[PDB]
Design a protein around this ligand. Sequence first.
Ligand SMILES: *[C@H](C)[C@H]1/C(=C/c2[nH]c(/C=C3N=C(/C=C4\NC(=O)C(CC)=C4C)C(C)=C\3CCC(=O)O)c(CCC(=O)O)c2C)NC(=O)[C@@H]1C
Ligand SMILES: *[C@H](C)[C@H]1/C(=C/c2[nH]c(/C=C3N=C(/C=C4\NC(=O)C(CC)=C4C)C(C)=C\3CCC(=O)O)c(CCC(=O)O)c2C)NC(=O)[C@@H]1C
Ligand SMILES: *[C@H](C)[C@H]1/C(=C/c2[nH]c(/C=C3N=C(/C=C4\NC(=O)C(CC)=C4C)C(C)=C\3CCC(=O)O)c(CCC(=O)O)c2C)NC(=O)[C@@H]1C
Ligand SMILES: *[C@H](C)[C@H]1/C(=C/c2[nH]c(/C=C3N=C(/C=C4\NC(=O)C(CC)=C4C)C(C)=C\3CCC(=O)O)c(CCC(=O)O)c2C)NC(=O)[C@@H]1C
Ligand SMILES: *[C@H](C)[C@H]1/C(=C/c2[nH]c(/C=C3N=C(/C=C4\NC(=O)C(CC)=C4C)C(C)=C\3CCC(=O)O)c(CCC(=O)O)c2C)NC(=O)[C@@H]1C
Ligand SMILES: *[C@H](C)[C@H]1/C(=C/c2[nH]c(/C=C3N=C(/C=C4\NC(=O)C(CC)=C4C)C(C)=C\3CCC(=O)O)c(CCC(=O)O)c2C)NC(=O)[C@@H]1C
Ligand SMILES: *[C@H](C)[C@H]1/C(=C/c2[nH]c(/C=C3N=C(/C=C4\NC(=O)C(CC)=C4C)C(C)=C\3CCC(=O)O)c(CCC(=O)O)c2C)NC(=O)[C@@H]1C
Ligand SMILES: *[C@H](C)[C@H]1/C(=C/c2[nH]c(/C=C3N=C(/C=C4\NC(=O)C(CC)=C4C)C(C)=C\3CCC(=O)O)c(CCC(=O)O)c2C)NC(=O)[C@@H]1C
Ligand SMILES: *[C@H](C)[C@H]1/C(=C/c2[nH]c(/C=C3N=C(/C=C4\NC(=O)C(CC)=C4C)C(C)=C\3CCC(=O)O)c(CCC(=O)O)c2C)NC(=O)[C@@H]1C
Ligand SMILES: *[C@H](C)[C@H]1/C(=C/c2[nH]c(/C=C3N=C(/C=C4\NC(=O)C(CC)=C4C)C(C)=C\3CCC(=O)O)c(CCC(=O)O)c2C)NC(=O)[C@@H]1C
Ligand SMILES: *[C@H](C)[C@H]1/C(=C/c2[nH]c(/C=C3N=C(/C=C4\NC(=O)C(CC)=C4C)C(C)=C\3CCC(=O)O)c(CCC(=O)O)c2C)NC(=O)[C@@H]1C
Ligand SMILES: *[C@H](C)[C@H]1/C(=C/c2[nH]c(/C=C3N=C(/C=C4\NC(=O)C(CC)=C4C)C(C)=C\3CCC(=O)O)c(CCC(=O)O)c2C)NC(=O)[C@@H]1C
Ligand SMILES: *[C@H](C)[C@H]1/C(=C/c2[nH]c(/C=C3N=C(/C=C4\NC(=O)C(CC)=C4C)C(C)=C\3CCC(=O)O)c(CCC(=O)O)c2C)NC(=O)[C@@H]1C
Lengths: 172, 172, 172, 172, 160, 160, 160, 160, 160
Amino acid sequence: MLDAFAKVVSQADTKGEFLSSAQLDALSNVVKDGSKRLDAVNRMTSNASTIVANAARSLFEEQPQLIQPGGNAYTNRRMAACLRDMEIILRYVTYATLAGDSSVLDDRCLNGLRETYQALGVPGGSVAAGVAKMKDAAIAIVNDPNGITKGDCSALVSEIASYFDRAAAAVA
Amino acid sequence: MLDAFAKVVSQADTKGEFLSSAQLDALSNVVKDGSKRLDAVNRMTSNASTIVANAARSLFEEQPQLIQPGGNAYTNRRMAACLRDMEIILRYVTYATLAGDSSVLDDRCLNGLRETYQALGVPGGSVAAGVAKMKDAAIAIVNDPNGITKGDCSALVSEIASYFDRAAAAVA
Amino acid sequence: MLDAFAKVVSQADTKGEFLSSAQLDALSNVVKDGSKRLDAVNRMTSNASTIVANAARSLFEEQPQLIQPGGNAYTNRRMAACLRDMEIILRYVTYATLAGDSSVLDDRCLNGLRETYQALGVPGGSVAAGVAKMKDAAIAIVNDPNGITKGDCSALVSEIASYFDRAAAAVA
Amino acid sequence: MLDAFAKVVSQADTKGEFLSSAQLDALSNVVKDGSKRLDAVNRMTSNASTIVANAARSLFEEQPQLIQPGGNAYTNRRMAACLRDMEIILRYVTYATLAGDSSVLDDRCLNGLRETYQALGVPGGSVAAGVAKMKDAAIAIVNDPNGITKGDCSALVSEIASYFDRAAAAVA
Amino acid sequence: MKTPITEAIAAADTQGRFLSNTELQAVNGRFERAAASMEAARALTNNAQQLIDGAANAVYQKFPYTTQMQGANFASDSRGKSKCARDIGYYLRIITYSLVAGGTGPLDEYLIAGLDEINRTFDLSPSWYVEALKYIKANHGLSGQAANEANTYIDYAINA
Amino acid sequence: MKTPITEAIAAADTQGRFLSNTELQAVNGRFERAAASMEAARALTNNAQQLIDGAANAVYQKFPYTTQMQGANFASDSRGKSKCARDIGYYLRIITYSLVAGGTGPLDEYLIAGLDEINRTFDLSPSWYVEALKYIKANHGLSGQAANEANTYIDYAINA
Amino acid sequence: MKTPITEAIAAADTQGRFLSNTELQAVNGRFERAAASMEAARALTNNAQQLIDGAANAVYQKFPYTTQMQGANFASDSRGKSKCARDIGYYLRIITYSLVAGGTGPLDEYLIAGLDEINRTFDLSPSWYVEALKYIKANHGLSGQAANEANTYIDYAINA
Amino acid sequence: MKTPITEAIAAADTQGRFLSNTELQAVNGRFERAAASMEAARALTNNAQQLIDGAANAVYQKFPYTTQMQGANFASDSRGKSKCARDIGYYLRIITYSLVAGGTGPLDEYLIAGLDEINRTFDLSPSWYVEALKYIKANHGLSGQAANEANTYIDYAINA
Amino acid sequence: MKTPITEAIAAADTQGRFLSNTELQAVNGRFERAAASMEAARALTNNAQQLIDGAANAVYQKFPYTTQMQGANFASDSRGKSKCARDIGYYLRIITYSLVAGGTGPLDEYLIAGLDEINRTFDLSPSWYVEALKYIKANHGLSGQAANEANTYIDYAINA
Ligand SMILES: *[C@H](C)[C@H]1/C(=C/c2[nH]c(/C=C3N=C(/C=C4\NC(=O)C(CC)=C4C)C(C)=C\3CCC(=O)O)c(CCC(=O)O)c2C)NC(=O)[C@@H]1C
Ligand SMILES: *[C@H](C)[C@H]1/C(=C/c2[nH]c(/C=C3N=C(/C=C4\NC(=O)C(CC)=C4C)C(C)=C\3CCC(=O)O)c(CCC(=O)O)c2C)NC(=O)[C@@H]1C
Ligand SMILES: *[C@H](C)[C@H]1/C(=C/c2[nH]c(/C=C3N=C(/C=C4\NC(=O)C(CC)=C4C)C(C)=C\3CCC(=O)O)c(CCC(=O)O)c2C)NC(=O)[C@@H]1C
Ligand SMILES: *[C@H](C)[C@H]1/C(=C/c2[nH]c(/C=C3N=C(/C=C4\NC(=O)C(CC)=C4C)C(C)=C\3CCC(=O)O)c(CCC(=O)O)c2C)NC(=O)[C@@H]1C
Ligand SMILES: *[C@H](C)[C@H]1/C(=C/c2[nH]c(/C=C3N=C(/C=C4\NC(=O)C(CC)=C4C)C(C)=C\3CCC(=O)O)c(CCC(=O)O)c2C)NC(=O)[C@@H]1C
Ligand SMILES: *[C@H](C)[C@H]1/C(=C/c2[nH]c(/C=C3N=C(/C=C4\NC(=O)C(CC)=C4C)C(C)=C\3CCC(=O)O)c(CCC(=O)O)c2C)NC(=O)[C@@H]1C
Ligand SMILES: *[C@H](C)[C@H]1/C(=C/c2[nH]c(/C=C3N=C(/C=C4\NC(=O)C(CC)=C4C)C(C)=C\3CCC(=O)O)c(CCC(=O)O)c2C)NC(=O)[C@@H]1C
Ligand SMILES: *[C@H](C)[C@H]1/C(=C/c2[nH]c(/C=C3N=C(/C=C4\NC(=O)C(CC)=C4C)C(C)=C\3CCC(=O)O)c(CCC(=O)O)c2C)NC(=O)[C@@H]1C
Ligand SMILES: *[C@H](C)[C@H]1/C(=C/c2[nH]c(/C=C3N=C(/C=C4\NC(=O)C(CC)=C4C)C(C)=C\3CCC(=O)O)c(CCC(=O)O)c2C)NC(=O)[C@@H]1C
Ligand SMILES: *[C@H](C)[C@H]1/C(=C/c2[nH]c(/C=C3N=C(/C=C4\NC(=O)C(CC)=C4C)C(C)=C\3CCC(=O)O)c(CCC(=O)O)c2C)NC(=O)[C@@H]1C
Ligand SMILES: *[C@H](C)[C@H]1/C(=C/c2[nH]c(/C=C3N=C(/C=C4\NC(=O)C(CC)=C4C)C(C)=C\3CCC(=O)O)c(CCC(=O)O)c2C)NC(=O)[C@@H]1C
Ligand SMILES: *[C@H](C)[C@H]1/C(=C/c2[nH]c(/C=C3N=C(/C=C4\NC(=O)C(CC)=C4C)C(C)=C\3CCC(=O)O)c(CCC(=O)O)c2C)NC(=O)[C@@H]1C
Ligand SMILES: *[C@H](C)[C@H]1/C(=C/c2[nH]c(/C=C3N=C(/C=C4\NC(=O)C(CC)=C4C)C(C)=C\3CCC(=O)O)c(CCC(=O)O)c2C)NC(=O)[C@@H]1C
């Protein structure tokens, strides 16, 4: 498991050279945006249920056969399992956003998950659609300018969305 | 595990005959040179670190990419592991010299070592070069006539060097 | 194990009342001096060996029979054990200073220690003298105004010294 | 377990002083008589059965009720057990003679043996008589001047006999 | 109890070593946040009675049947009103305890571990207290990160 | 590797739960200290060569026999001087790595785990490098808490 | 096989360390005694046939019935005499092996582990070979410590 | 304690048997080497003070800062000089103990098991004592195998 | 599934024996109660829509904010009303399943094992459905022991 500092240190050690001014500047920018990153992580974790609810609402709205008799979640068990899956994926996205690196999300979650879903018979495309809707809802909620000090969070939003396409592409 | 006496006794027992005067003379010569053998073993063990240092210095002098970035020992771990390997090989050479037989060195060390080195990706040729440099340094140090009583140690030097080519040929 | 906040919260919960303005003011003062407390803890831990050395020097200077033949530490074993004991006591003092409460030092260290020392035959009075000399050396080192921003650390010094008499009185 | 060198080193270390010329001279005399000591140990161990036989013959000659019906060894079991006991005591005497110190004989053999014999009902006085006869036979056999180089072994004989009275007094 | 400082000390002690720079960094974070935590605690303690009365009235206006239906589990008379004010006082008291301690420890230990059996037995619906805590959150008068901290623990309270 | 952030994430993951307020406080401490950590790293990296040369000369003046006695393990010629400068460069490089990472991880992993066998084999006395690091600590030109951080890790380096 | 040198090497190897001064002292003792051991081996090997014939004749004179009674287990004819000479030759051969090796290893391994079942099955009394070895011990012509060594191993042979 | 004789006796006792020829050979080696061991011990004990003073002066000339810098861990005054002479005396005393005992036992038990914590705590660099022991090794005035034995144990002392 | 008959058969089979008189008595009790159970199931199934609409209207009158406040988790528009009717239909359907089966099996398996995570995620308060089930219990039109059975399972439903 690596974060940004650990990745930079490993890549500089394997080559045996001091850190260039570029890497120092990048890590100093990471440090400067650390407070925005903590804001994003706190807001995403403490509003996790609302994000999951919005994503599920959209997914069941555009693919209603999912919640109709004979569908792939027409019961308390499968509904709760889908919601657990969605909360898990959001939790690992919050991990990657706090770490500033996708290594934990790729290695511990996105490895072998695609095989699991097609072995279980769960349609992966609808999972990817739900993940994209999670991305939309999460970015909408993070950028909410109320109750906070005005500022630019565009880089973090881009990074979090990049994590989301990495998650969606690992099951599509 | 055999020494010279045990090897001679086994070979004479498998044929069922008394020891010939040739074998008796050879073993009596071994007994007569026992003190020189103890001198060689003591000097080689109590100066082991200097021998390893000289060998490593020569090896890194003629193959400097070993200690340059990207090389096969450019770190505390791989450096210490190479030095441990070198000290191990010297220790087993001291075992064989004290025993007056290569059986321990062949059976317990040189069996499967070549497979280990190519499975690990360590270049065996440079290992053989380092072993040859150990041979040169050890023979130089053993023959040092200072602090000791004048005498002929040429047979022991030849035998120890023979052990060294057996070691170097087992990994080359 | 309690710190100041936990002690205040427990004592207020057992009585069932909100925190009075007195306790709030006291805890706000603790918060305000938190940075001085971190300075004290860092300087005491990173200079622990010098403190132990000074204390041991004074103790052996005023009680030289300790380091004379027949004394209670005239060997590598007993010397190293005394130094280990001294480093342990200083470590638990640093714990109590960081916590702002003596509960850890009393419950986990000062309970049954006096019985241990008289059962072992180690003279507890000289241990108390060494503890007092540790107090003097530690307070001297903490108040050093060099390399730091000018300010008042008298309350922390009094508190740390109070921990020291609690330690010295538990073995005297 | 201590030998003479270890005892002298411990007693000099507990006082913290170099070895006096007296102790050096005593240990040098021990070294000088080491060859006589090895002769005594070898002759006593390789003739152990003859010593036991002579001792048992004398003991049964002067106390014949031991080997008469109703006696305390009138059977293969008790006879063999007595001979085992006698061989054990002689073996530990050979240990103490080789070590040049009675510590092994006292600590590992003579501790609690007297209680064992009176708890078993074996008459300890006759055991002491047999031990004294072992002393006589062993000293007779050790001093035999045939097959060896002429020399003085009086000090070793006195020491071995001292071990024997220590053994006999531990059960009498 | 479960505070960051006690947790750091226990982590350091379990491995028998001096305190590391990581634990001092964590204690530094605790000390820097304790200013806002104590400000929020002081504010919530000073305006306690106003908040209690406002929350009780919000509960009455939101669930009117609680003032109309007869029955012991309701607030149709003075005894019910006083019990409800006492309950909301317990809630606010323990949330201020947790704000003071700097963690969920007091909430985990003094309230949540027994609230469920209490509410089932006496037929008290959790949504009443949910609405009371929502009112308190919307009307505590705090601003900035101190308010953020208060809201963090209030949301911890909401997940009854 | 052992960083505070990775340690917090692993603690949160091992119990299968979202991140708690304690871990966010710890990451806040890390982020606030990373400013001084990065300032110290940048300073030590920019003035690297001056520090290397000054430390080498301090070693030569303090242990003069190292410049006089013949033998391969000494710095009597140019090869020894260059090897010593390379060694001090390795030391400074790994200390800057550790300052960047914010923990003892890089020092524990890349230097200390193998330094002892290396020094025994090639007859290199640790006090040479101790004196070099003492010089670097006394002559890095940093002020305040950034200097304090640098000195923390330099003292970590001293306990070879 | 069980020699002092192999035992020392195995002791040193089992703990993964270089050879200690104690093991070199033991090997020194082995080397100093090997001179007498080899002298005794050479002497016993050169005069082998004389010793064999003398031991056979001693057995015949001591137990006369072995030359008189008929039966396959006796030496009443030439076949028995030749078998007995072969047997005593085996005994002397293995004792010389043990003298060469410097330990009881060869005697423990090649003779004693199977002698008992052999002697019970073919009705060979051990006292015959005891008397033969006693004769060999009294008539080997060795003097001093070499003779002492030979007698040590001969007594090892006696305890059949 | 760990002597060859005690080790042989313990090996013989653990298997409940008489002493074998191998153990007597080992004790013979011990007895033959004890002559040189005792000669070396006597020599090192007689010339103790000369060696102590020469080693102290060698330390002062080799590391001159130890005579110049102020501070309690140095030998700038008479107290430091006397402490250093006492220390070198302890070293020589325990090496002579080990020479007398014939093994590394006393060195393993009375010095090495506690030297590391002592030296770290009082900021005593091991290279001082390394240089002192090197001087003692180069200036003990012994010749032949007795000198070889002394040097064996001195090198055991060097690997602090 | 967990029915009395299947439980009796499994008890009889686990001990490898024929059915005992106790199990036949239990099956007799099941058969005698199944008449009332089936009457209650038929009644609740026939008047399903009337009960659904009455329960929805009771929920609206009891918690008026659910018809007024905007937000997706409310029944302010037609979509919310239809979802709520579907939910109450699920509840009634599974209670009739359980009445048919004669045990809590269907309620334990198809509803209760997943209701809690569903309600927390979509912010649905259990008291809404509690009030709906209370209305259904007070307005099912059953009389006697069949009504008693229905109320038994309705109270099982209440303890959400
Ligand atoms: C919901 C968005 C979709 C879907 C979900 C669904 N899943 C199951 C079962 C499983 N889901 C997982 C996923 C994970 N388990 C982990 O530990 C992790 C990482 C930490 C992940 C990502 C797994 C392993 C399973 C199988 C084992 C289990 O259930 O725990 C079901 C049930 C299928 C069935 O009952 O036949 C469902 C329904 N269904 C949808 O319709 C959505 C597209
Ligand atoms: C980005 C998504 C949005 C945003 C971020 C933003 N916040 C500030 C204010 C701050 N928020 C924090 C966060 C924490 N402090 C803690 O102790 C904890 C854990 C309990 C957290 C999560 C901090 C430290 C600050 C700075 C101090 C303050 O109170 O203001 C800013 C301005 C200051 C800055 O960027 O450093 C910004 C930009 N603002 C937006 O507009 C985005 C939508
Ligand atoms: C140094 C001269 C060369 C070289 C060495 C090197 N080795 C490794 C790892 C291993 N070395 C061994 C050898 C032995 N282990 C034994 O027990 C014995 C006999 C008792 C021998 C001879 C083994 C088994 C390994 C693998 C397991 C281990 O490391 O302990 C490395 C590390 C490789 C890496 O990190 O990728 C190195 C570098 N490297 C050189 O450049 C020299 C040619
Ligand atoms: C051969 C590499 C060099 C050499 C050997 C040499 N040595 C002697 C002297 C002796 N060295 C020993 C060794 C030991 N005695 C012990 O107790 C121990 C273990 C602690 C050891 C290792 C011995 C016994 C002797 C003989 C007695 C003496 O002190 O002289 C000689 C001459 C005597 C002989 O060969 O037997 C020789 C030749 N000399 C060289 O020139 C070689 C470089
Ligand atoms: C040194 C200042 C004094 C003194 C010390 C001394 N101690 C021993 C042995 C022990 N010391 C302790 C103390 C502790 N062990 C713990 O775990 C803790 C708290 C975490 C404490 C405070 C204990 C338990 C022992 C006995 C077990 C052990 O040794 O580990 C000795 C050795 C005594 C001897 O060898 O006979 C000494 C010398 N001696 C002095 O002169 C000082 C006054
Ligand atoms: C009291 C013993 C002495 C003293 C204390 C003092 N320090 C400041 C400066 C500061 N020291 C710190 C400490 C840390 N920050 C961290 O991140 C860590 C862990 C890595 C530590 C240990 C801090 C935060 C400050 C304030 C910021 C700054 O750099 O100045 C002061 C003045 C500011 C204050 O008190 O808050 C004081 C008084 N000064 C003395 O004179 C005493 C001898
Ligand atoms: C013979 C000289 C005398 C005597 C001997 C006798 N002993 C027993 C039984 C025992 N002898 C011992 C002694 C030892 N066991 C040990 O391990 C050691 C040290 C290593 C010693 C010294 C013990 C313990 C016993 C009891 C257990 C056992 O038998 O092994 C008997 C048998 C008594 C009986 O059968 O009733 C005898 C006869 N008897 C004599 O007449 C002599 C005086
Ligand atoms: C004392 C009981 C009697 C006695 C002793 C004696 N022996 C010598 C001769 C020697 N005996 C040995 C012994 C051994 N060498 C080995 O290798 C082994 C183990 C296999 C043993 C047991 C030795 C080394 C000697 C010296 C060399 C030699 O062959 O002569 C002497 C004279 C020499 C001396 O004392 O050192 C003596 C006195 N003689 C008596 O009269 C006592 C009855
Ligand atoms: C007020 C918001 C609503 C409500 C209040 C009410 N409560 C009771 C009785 C009890 N309330 C509690 C709650 C707690 N006691 C504790 O110690 C803690 C931990 C901090 C809590 C959360 C309890 C235990 C009881 C029963 C025991 C007691 O009386 O103390 C009543 C009376 C109900 C009755 O008598 O049956 C009422 C009315 N009811 C409403 O209608 C308000 C909206
Ligand atoms: C300089 C301060 C003193 C000193 C330097 C010196 N070193 C050598 C050889 C080596 N130095 C190292 C150290 C490291 N290599 C690594 O990868 C790491 C981890 C970051 C470290 C700490 C090593 C391994 C060697 C040996 C292999 C090599 O050459 O690279 C020499 C030459 C000694 C010789 O050839 O025998 C010297 C001179 N010596 C002094 O006198 C300076 C005071
Ligand atoms: C001679 C001293 C007395 C004796 C000899 C005798 N032996 C046989 C037959 C056998 N002797 C042996 C002994 C060994 N064979 C081995 O390999 C070894 C290990 C070194 C030993 C000790 C054996 C095995 C036999 C039987 C098999 C064989 O013949 O080789 C005979 C013939 C008896 C018969 O045929 O039944 C005799 C006569 N008998 C005497 O009277 C001599 C005094
Ligand atoms: C002299 C070579 C250098 C040196 C000496 C020095 N030592 C101290 C204090 C101590 N020396 C020891 C060493 C031992 N004590 C033992 O029992 C043993 C086992 C045999 C050893 C190895 C110890 C324990 C101490 C501290 C306790 C004591 O004083 O006895 C000083 C004083 C330092 C101070 O007071 O802080 C000095 C000067 N220093 C030099 O500069 C010399 C080169
Ligand atoms: C009606 C009494 C109140 C209410 C209804 C409401 N529900 C939603 C969405 C959902 N209802 C369920 C319940 C179940 N589905 C099952 O399979 C089972 C097991 C039998 C149960 C108990 C679920 C899972 C959902 C979410 C998925 C879905 O839509 O099917 C809404 C919409 C809320 C939203 O979109 O966010 C509503 C309005 N809300 C009220 O106000 C009524 C009082």
